């Protein structure tokens, strides 16, 4: 027995229901992608390893 309030707390979320706001206005969209964050890596090596 699993109650609906338990699902809303513990279960993961699907992707197909979303709302997008552009500026101060909301526009219905079909697909949104690319929200990624990337960093570079700086390395330094010396003679003693």
């Amino acid at each position: 027995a699993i109650t609906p309030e338990q699902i809303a707390v513990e279960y993961p979320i699907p992707t197909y229901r979303f709302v997008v706001s552009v500026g101060d206005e909301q526009i219905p969209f079909n697909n949104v992608s690319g929200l990624d964050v990337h960093y570079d890596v700086i390395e330094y090596k010396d003679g003693i390893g």
Partner: protein, 148 residues
């Protein structure tokens, strides 16, 4: 005949016969070279052979690169010389280490004089470590070890 790699090395600076324990890690050390300067002489009737006459021996310079870090005795000596104070000498021992941290080849330099300190550019678009470049001019070079 097994060759040795060139990415494991150590350098030690001695100031007044006292080694500096914080100045052993460097990003790069330039190769050490010795040259016997010669002039070519030509005889009168000798048009098919060459003659080379020996002269004094020229030593190269010692260049090191290192990132910006906490002030060390090597830094203080370099700053004092380049601030206009009395010139001082230092002795350097470069060692090439094997897998057991045993120096297979070592070079010793007598009376090294700090002559140049430089730093990298401040670039707002870069992803790199700020690197100091040091150069010294020494009087004599001498190598010791089982390999060379």
């Amino acid at each position: 005949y097994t060759p040795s790699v060139s990415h494991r090395f150590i350098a030690s600076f001695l100031f007044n016969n006292i080694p500096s324990p914080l100045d052993i890690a460097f990003q790069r050390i330039s190769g050490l070279s010795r040259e016997l300067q010669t002039t070519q002489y030509s005889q009168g009737g000798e048009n098919a052979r060459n003659v080379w006459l020996a002269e004094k021996i020229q030593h190269g310079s010692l260049h090191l690169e290192r990132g910006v870090m906490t002030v060390t005795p090597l830094t203080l000596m370099f700053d004092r010389v380049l601030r206009g104070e009395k010139a001082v000498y230092a002795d350097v021992v470069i060692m090439l280490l094997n897998e057991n941290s045993v120096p297979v080849a070592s070079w010793t330099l007598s009376n090294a004089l700090p002559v140049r300190w430089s730093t990298g550019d401040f670039d707002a678009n870069s992803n790199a470590v700020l690197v100091n470049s040091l150069e010294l001019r020494y009087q004599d070079m001498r190598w010791l070890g089982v390999k060379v």
